[PDB]
């Protein structure tokens, strides 16, 4: 139950500085007051970050997704290669209740969205879901800056997350905040592209304040500092400058 549109929305993709965001805890080992050097896939410092005000974007190795979100307009995520019934696809939705994660051979049309009724009762993202392999339910994920990191390594889909109170207008904050791991999924797909999902106010769609920041990951070596409480407070990117 999905139809096309006439208002061909075109998001004005601008560019911004990455600053020093996108650092997460790499392992499950506690460490206190120590400088540890580790090599892994990270977001390099001071890189370009694309700003979108829903194009199909390539996944590459992994994705850093940020949103200075208000009222939580963003709902879900789509992952796959062709986003059709010919290949396995991953879907994530986060409504006012527990999240839903599915890995199935969906049938995605041109404009997938949730839809809200005014008491919400609407779900018309796709058209068919024949073969399903994995399902998952847990706590809901979501003025405020929400950061997520998606990785796909060794048949494991890692999703890390963090929430921060922010008050700056547009630019990404100049500060440091580690990312605690959120969930690991033991499912193997060959994802190469992804999308985003919006809950447009269906009563004519009115979803224009849909801004999100996208950045990509590269493999490199970092130096991390753990304080006495085991919290990462500082990091140094090795391959950035002679000083580094």
């Amino acid at each position: 139950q999905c139809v096309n549109f006439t208002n061909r929305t075109q998001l004005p993709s601008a560019y911004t500085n990455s600053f020093t965001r996108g650092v997460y805890y790499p392992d499950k080992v506690f460490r206190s007051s120590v400088l540890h050097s580790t090599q892994d896939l990270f977001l390099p410092f001071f890189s370009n970050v694309t700003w979108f005000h829903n194009p199909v974007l390539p996944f590459n190795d992994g994705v850093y997704f940020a949103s200075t979100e208000k009222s939580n307009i963003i709902r879900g995520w789509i992952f796959g290669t062709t986003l059709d019934s010919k290949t396995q696809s991953l879907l994530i939705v986060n409504n006012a209740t527990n999240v839903v994660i599915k890995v199935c051979e969906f049938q995605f049309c041109n404009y997938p969205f949730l839809g809200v009724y005014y008491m919400e009762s609407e779900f018309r993202v796709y058209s068919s879901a024949n073969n399903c392999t994995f399902e998952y339910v847990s706590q809901p994920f979501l003025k405020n800056l929400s950061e997520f990191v998606f990785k796909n390594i060794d048949g494991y889909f890692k999703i890390y997350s963090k929430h921060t109170p922010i008050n700056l207008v547009r630019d990404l904050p100049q500060g440091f905040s580690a990312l605690e791991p959120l969930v690991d999924l033991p499912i193997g797909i060959n994802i190469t592209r992804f999308q985003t999902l919006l809950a447009l106010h269906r009563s004519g769609w009115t979803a224009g304040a849909a801004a999100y920041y996208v950045g990509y990951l590269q493999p490199r070596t970092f130096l991390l500092k753990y304080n006495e409480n085991g919290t990462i407070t500082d990091a140094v990117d090795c391959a950035l400058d002679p000083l580094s």
Binding site: Y25, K28, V29, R31, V34
Partner: protein
């Protein structure tokens, strides 16, 4: 002891280092998670239908307790070959992410299933990594996977552009440009279909019949353990040098109520060079810290065997509160003293001060009058 360690029947006045002492542990403890449910192995082995080598079937197993004794003691398996572990030790290891890859092969290629091997299926259908850890199971299936008229549902690929990366499956059934002549979707000449079936008939002798083969692949200490063997947990005791086995992690030391705080997702902690300082117990989910029970070096002070035979014993850097080499003779009632160097037994401290003969350390030194 000093005579024996110095290889002489006489010893001169001085101080000699003989050996070290350690506190022996007792009451070994095994602590495993509470998750207990039979792990589904039979249906993998007793499956009616298997898959061709180019489409080998994979199953992921986790959150179960596994009994490998039924597999090991059964003689139905012609080849039971384990590489990184011993078959008899499999009932005492905890680990995650069990992988079971099942298929059926030609009888003569069974020894191509090994790390660092070259063959037809070894490089075009299924290649194992060099550092593979796990086991392989091979057993004949003449009575089932062979037909008198000849079954041909079992396929294998002979032509490919290049080799295969370890743990990779290819199901691309496309014509291959065998020669310089292009195919353009038509076989013609110098082009052949990569896949062909097997001529399995009961008429063939040994080494020709189909063999059902399944490989089990493991991981070693890279996650919170999810699969464990048939072992019984016990209670924990603190403040005593004991042997402990936490979820396959073996060690020896004393356990204490730790003060450090863990975020809700770690499992343990370390400081420098694989020194596991803290551990979370799998059942009670209570943090503890581990420190090895006391040890030290022992030295003797003797005035020379030509003069007398009395000796004094110094335990270096050890608190005198606990001391009892057995040598219970110097543990009953002999005079004891505590100095910054350690604990001294057999010598008495005197307020008189004058130059000494046998230095001890930290300004303390001893001599023969007793």
């Amino acid at each position: 002891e000093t005579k024996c360690t110095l290889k002489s029947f006489t010893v001169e006045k001085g101080i000699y280092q003989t050996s070290n002492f350690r506190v022996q542990p007792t009451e070994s403890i095994v602590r495993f998670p509470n998750i207990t449910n039979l792990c589904p192995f039979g249906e993998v082995f007793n499956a009616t239908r298997f898959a061709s080598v180019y489409a080998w079937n994979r199953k992921r197993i986790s959150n179960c307790v596994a009994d490998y004794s039924v597999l090991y003691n059964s003689a139905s398996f012609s080849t039971f070959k384990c590489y990184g572990v011993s078959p008899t030790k499999l009932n005492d290891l905890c680990f995650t992410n069990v992988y079971a890859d099942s298929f059926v092969i030609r009888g003569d290629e069974v020894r191509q299933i090994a790390p660092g091997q070259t063959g037809t299926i070894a490089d075009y259908n299924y290649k194992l990594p060099d550092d593979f850890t796990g086991c392989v199971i091979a057993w004949n299936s003449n009575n089932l996977d062979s037909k008198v008229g000849g079954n041909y549902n079992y396929l294998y690929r002979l032509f490919r552009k290049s080799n295969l990366k370890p743990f990779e499956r290819d199901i691309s059934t496309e014509i291959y440009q065998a020669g310089s002549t292009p195919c353009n979707g038509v076989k013609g000449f110098n082009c052949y279909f990569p896949l062909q079936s097997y001529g399995f008939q009961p008429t063939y002798g040994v080494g020709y019949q189909p063999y059902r083969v399944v490989v089990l692949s493991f991981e070693l200490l890279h996650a919170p353990a999810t699969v464990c063997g048939p072992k019984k947990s016990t209670n924990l005791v603190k403040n005593k040098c004991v042997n402990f086995n936490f979820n396959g992690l073996t060690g020896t030391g004393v356990l204490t109520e730790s003060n450090k705080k863990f975020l809700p997702f770690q499992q343990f902690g370390r400081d420098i060079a694989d020194t596991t300082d803290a551990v979370r117990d799998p059942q009670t989910l209570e943090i503890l810290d581990i420190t090895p029970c006391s040890f030290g070096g022992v030295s003797v002070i003797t005035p020379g065997t030509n003069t007398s035979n009395q000796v004094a014993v110094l335990y270096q850097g050890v608190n005198c509160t606990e001391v009892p080499p057995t040598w219970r003779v110097y543990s009953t009632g002999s005079n004891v003293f505590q100095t910054r160097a350690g604990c001294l037994i057999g010598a008495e401290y005197v307020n008189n001060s004058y130059e000494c003969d046998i230095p001890i350390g930290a300004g303390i030194c001893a001599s023969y009058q007793s």
